[PDB]
Amino acid sequence: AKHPVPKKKTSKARRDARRSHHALTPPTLVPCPECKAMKPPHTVCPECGYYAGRKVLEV
């Protein structure tokens, strides 16, 4: 509401033509070492995922 303003109502085309990028990507997942559960890499997985320094397990 002021100085610069939209000259024309953008076309439905150009609108979605710019959102051609907002397309969301799928996470990056990998199988946990032990439990046959799926989980994102380099992370002390939500099911006892890791060895040595406590793996904040589900025990």
Binding site: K39, P40, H42, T43, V44, C45, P46, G49, Y50, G53, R54, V56
Partner: protein, 118 residues
């Protein structure tokens, strides 16, 4: 630029950012394991390690230079008499950092874990 500089600015100013670390420290050396944002941790290492290494060499001057950051006699005590030991034959990395796979909700902050190795 703002090239070869090293040392996260944590959307905090001097006295805050500093007094922040001293509080991460006190926690970490009382509970042995703390959970924070991955970054807030990646920094905590060196601040603590130092505190600990100053503990091994542990004499009087070390007891004090260390106290300056913890202010608490006890704990400062528990660190020199029960923590320092466990590391006397370990040179470096007296601290660990392990990323968590879940993010704080209604915020979405990537988390991590911090425990004293060994």
């Amino acid at each position: 630029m703002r090239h070869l500089k090293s040392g996260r600015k944590l959307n905090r100013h001097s006295s805050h950012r500093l007094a922040l670390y001293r509080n991460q420290a006190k926690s970490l050396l009382t509970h042995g394991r703390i959970t924070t944002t991955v970054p807030k941790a990646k920094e905590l290492r060196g601040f603590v390690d130092h505190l600990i290494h100053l503990a091994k060499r542990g004499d009087l001057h070390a007891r004090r230079l260390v106290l300056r950051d913890l202010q608490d006699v006890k704990l400062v005590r528990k660190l020199f008499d029960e923590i320092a030991p466990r590391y006397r034959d370990r040179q470096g990395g007296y601290t660990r950092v392990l990323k968590l796979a879940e993010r704080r909700r209604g915020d979405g902050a990537p988390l991590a874990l911090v425990e004293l190795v060994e």
